[PDB]
Design a protein around this ligand. Structure first.
Ligand SMILES: Cc1ccc(C(=O)O)o1
Ligand SMILES: Cc1ccc(C(=O)O)o1
Length: 118
């Protein structure tokens, strides 16, 4: 179906856009990266369905704000995608995580859903 085809394509863009952010952070010099790792992200208790993307949506502004602060367009792609994919009350885990743990969680989420559509 057209909605299924669009969904798979959007998740693929989401996955790659998240990875591109992570790659960029991984390219920070060590002292800068060390400081970036002090920032905390809330994490989904459960993330197995598109509706769970609400847990990502609520952290997109913090994500983009810290990236901007880190430098003294990918987020815009992600914003549209997450909004449209999610179409519910988000449960968060008790413990927060670093930007690296946060991005890896949502990259893994994206691949998991993609693998149910291939
Ligand atoms: C990365 C990629 C190439 C083609 C597709 C797709 O069929 O969604 O995805
Ligand atoms: C991303 C983000 C928002 C707030 C924080 C923090 O105080 O660690 O980190």
């Amino acid at each position: 179906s057209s909605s299924t085809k669009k969904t798979q394509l959007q998740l693929e863009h989401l996955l790659l856009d998240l990875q591109m952010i992570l790659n960029g952070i991984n390219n920070y010099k060590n002292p800068k990266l060390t400081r970036m790792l002090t920032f905390k992200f809330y994490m989904p208790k459960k993330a197995t369905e598109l509706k769970h993307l609400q847990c990502l949506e609520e952290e997109l502004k913090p994500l983009e704000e810290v990236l901007n602060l880190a430098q003294s367009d990918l987020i815009s792609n992600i914003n549209v995608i997450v909004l449209e994919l999610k179409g519910f009350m988000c449960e968060y885990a008790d413990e927060t995580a670093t930007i690296v743990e946060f991005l890896n969680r949502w990259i893994t989420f994206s691949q998991s859903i993609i693998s149910t559509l291939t």
